[PDB]
Design a protein around this ligand. Structure first.
Ligand SMILES: *[C@@H](C[C@H](O)[C@H](O)CO)C(=O)O
Ligand SMILES: *[C@@H](C[C@H](O)[C@H](O)CO)C(=O)O
Ligand SMILES: *[C@H](C[C@H](O)[C@H](O)CO)C(=O)O
Ligand SMILES: *[C@H](C[C@H](O)[C@H](O)CO)C(=O)O
Lengths: 293, 293, 293, 293
């Protein structure tokens, strides 16, 4: 199974993508063993990016690696098709899309038509990004089977039965969990890996969890998974999407600029409180030799 | 109380806004007794419009009327602030925003900041568009009070206790329900009216439910409310946002072109089946003299 | 429209029904203008009562009045049938049942059969007690129509569109809201009344809101409804079912003993903090001559 | 890890517990390798049982094996205390309780006090039965740690993150999933097993999944798990609690009488239809040498 990072998008204080900070982060993740990078995902604020900015993300990360799944979805199908077509010139792993968001109670037929349209124009394997809480609707294993053209799915949902059903109904699909908390379990249970937001700031931890689980060191894998869970939980206190920038600086040492408002940066008081929640974990990880310092 | 129309956005065959068609629709709404037009709302596919398109919509409708509430919200706060500022040379009723959508679990602090920012830059009264199911979060009476700068609220929620609480906690605030099914009830119970999607295609009915209820003719208001409910229900069969276009052409006699995919137009057969569901209702309304021929 | 009290079941210090206190409570409710008493409801802790105790509550209240709806539902259909049958010697308004609770995913067919079974053996008119949050299932206007034998419905739900639909789909059905916060609205919108927990302790307030709304004094009815809402809200702080006991003694001047654990009594401090939250309101109602003091 | 059966309670035509049938089923389960029996659980319709019937189930099952977890909870705490103190004379594994069900919005303090009360009187280890959808309340790993007296937990929830959390926050606690669909996964990931409704009718399948997973034959375990999932899905067509009876007689060859209405028995036609849905699965199981024929 693989660890895939939904890469954060660094923005400048002028609210533009900071390409040079993006490349440093991408080079580091690849160096520390991350298999592939998911670009324009939730963690990268994809829904806050214009199509031009989605493409800009791909270009900059493509300077570092071709190990990329390129998220192109949105509420203007013509723009999503254009991005899909444009990816022809990049030797990447796949494109992806979440379901059309915001609008409640979209028919099954319309949702299927949306995805099959992307498949029809896609010059690469197409990944489903299933995230019901964010998008307001579910594209479960049976609907995915009906769409019929997915190479893989990232299933972000608090229900592993739901995730296993993709494998059960679609044996040749790649099936990933969107949870950092499930890296040990997913590697234990025959699933294909994790697109793990926490691998932005602790790629070492997520890779080592997966390694230990593969080795069938399940108790050791769980011990480390449970320390990583505490960092995930600390990140959620002030808002994980914002906290991810702070934790990446803290653990990896380079910064990633600002998020894009209304995803606001943590203020000084919030940062201090976040660091006090994780510095002990950071000590344990250095002790364990997972982190250098 | 008032009937406000979240006006449909007509698109051409090639996915641009049909400005002349939008002006015809707007003019007919005003002439048929609609009080204001809520531009770039959900019914208008506001989340699917770039900021420039949001501005185009305001300019087209403004050629017809200044009775406008201009919705400017989005996931790029620099863009919504720009739209808010640009509205200064339009003598309109107000600007509006839904909450930042898609991203789950955004903090009270951050949501509060987003809306206080818009109010800080706004040259007009600001209206809250509260839509928990689409945006994934709720800006209730309490949070509205803490933001402290809203002139009015559109509450799209089935819970009328929730809507009544805006008035309870903010006595001066104008408070509209986002439901077509609650026109008689809103009018009876001391609230300020409805922002009603179905008034796009049946403005005569929604204006008449309001008036009946205003005159304490509750049984009659309800009779007509219950008829209108059947039309809402039929619009949901193939997708209300797509169905609104078909109903407007059917009931009002002019067309509004296409929605924007992934809000896909109904096909011929769905159009036919939709019309069959509402024929006998059209007939009742002609007979009641609410509609002509 | 009516105000109906889902009467509290006072328990003794050794966890038995206090018959004398229940008769004293029932006399006062009837004296103060309450229309009917709903016995073994949620407020009465019906699900915590054995079938014997549910009969005992009926016998006691019936000493005071004929104006009783007798709730008999439970997870043993034979006991519910037996309570239905035993009601034949009581000259009461009707019997009632919530849907079978606890077990999720019960089929529509098995739900219809449970209610049709009770209608088949009932010597009295049958009222639907619809409470989806408590029971885990919804018996909506269309399901009620399918069951076909309800004389009325109490709909405890935060969605008045849902409550209105009972009237729409079943024009002869009596339709009550289970909300205290909706007394002004329900009377202004053509529904039949409220089965209101808060009328245990403020029957005078509930009757007055209803009267003011009936007389079309909506702003007066709201002002009063909004004050009542603050009392409801205070009661939720430490748990409504437990607080109702404390409030009834505070406002009506007699003791109602204890709830039945695990609905635990308020402790001295909770009781003191609660009274502190409503004492300003008690003063205002005295000043308005709604409460005599 | 273990497979624990939440054993069905067989009822006679006249709605009493069929002791002899219960004993035969209990005996067969143990002989087929089931580790422990969970008595008066959801599958055994415990909320539909009086305290006297809960105790009668314990006595009959105790004739067969002492490997019993005795579920005692309900909405009368005195009766649950009584059942707990009565279990003193039985040399069994433990007692258990779900949270007080039906009543929404019970405070954490009241839920804690309910369980600690049962812990203070228990003559055996105490197990948490956590079932949020059925009871309306979640007693999560943090609340479990606060209560402080649980030897183990049965977590009936699809979110395995939530189940792993009990282990994380309470490392000495026995942690079981209530899902039949998570048997391979739970065994793989270092949890203690499953309390599986489907082990009533396919005990041999559930124990083999567990053993395959234990042997790290994940693909083989999943294959069998996926077949087992199809029987669970089939059981849900006409209602799982009712269907469990028909499947047990079908797969195990003896009958378990009747459920207790409103859990109504399947009819002849529904039985025929269910069997036709699982026939082909039975053939697969025979071909895999799990079942004889
Ligand atoms: C995917 C990873 C998950 O969707 C986020 O965990 C959900 O917050 C991504 O694109 O970030
Ligand atoms: C426990 C087993 C689970 O609670 C169910 O199988 C899911 O409803 C039980 O006691 O039946
Ligand atoms: C307002 C009306 C409601 O928001 C929608 O009708 C709900 O679908 C609007 O902006 O369209
Ligand atoms: C009816 C009152 C409402 O059903 C509950 O108070 C809602 O909590 C009853 O029987 O109490």
């Amino acid at each position: 199974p693989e660890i895939i990072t939904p890469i954060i998008t660094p923005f400048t204080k002028d609210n533009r993508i900071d390409k040079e900070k993006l490349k440093i982060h991408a080079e580091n993740l690849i160096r520390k063993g991350i298999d592939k990078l998911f670009v324009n995902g939730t963690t990268g604020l994809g829904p806050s990016l214009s199509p031009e900015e989605k493409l800009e993300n791909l270009k900059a990360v493509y300077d570092v690696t071709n190990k990329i799944i390129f998220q192109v979805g949105g509420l203007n199908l013509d723009d999503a098709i254009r991005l899909a077509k444009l990816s022809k010139d990049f030797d990447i792993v796949g494109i992806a899309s979440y379901a059309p968001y915001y609008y409640p109670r979209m028919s099954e037929k319309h949702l299927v038509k949306y995805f099959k349209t992307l498949c029809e124009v896609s010059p690469h394997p197409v990944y489903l990004y299933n995230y019901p809480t964010a998008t307001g609707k579910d594209i479960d294993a049976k609907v995915a089977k009906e769409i019929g053209c997915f190479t893989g799915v990232k299933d972000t949902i608090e229900n592993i039965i739901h995730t296993l059903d993709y494998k059960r109904l679609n044996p040749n699909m790649l099936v990933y969990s969107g949870s950092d908390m499930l890296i040990a379990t997913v590697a234990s249970t025959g699933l294909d890996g994790n697109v793990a937001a926490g691998s932005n700031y602790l790629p070492e931890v997520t890779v080592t969890i997966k390694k230990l689980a593969m080795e069938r060191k399940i108790d050791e894998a769980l011990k480390l998974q449970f320390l990583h869970d505490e960092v995930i939980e600390a990140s959620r206190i002030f808002g994980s999407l914002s906290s991810n920038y702070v934790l990446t600086k803290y653990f990896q040492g380079y910064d990633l600029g600002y998020p894009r408002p209304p995803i606001f940066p943590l203020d000084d008081e919030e940062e201090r409180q976040l660091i006090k929640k994780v510095e002990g974990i950071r000590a344990k990880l250095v002790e364990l030799k997972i982190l250098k310092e």
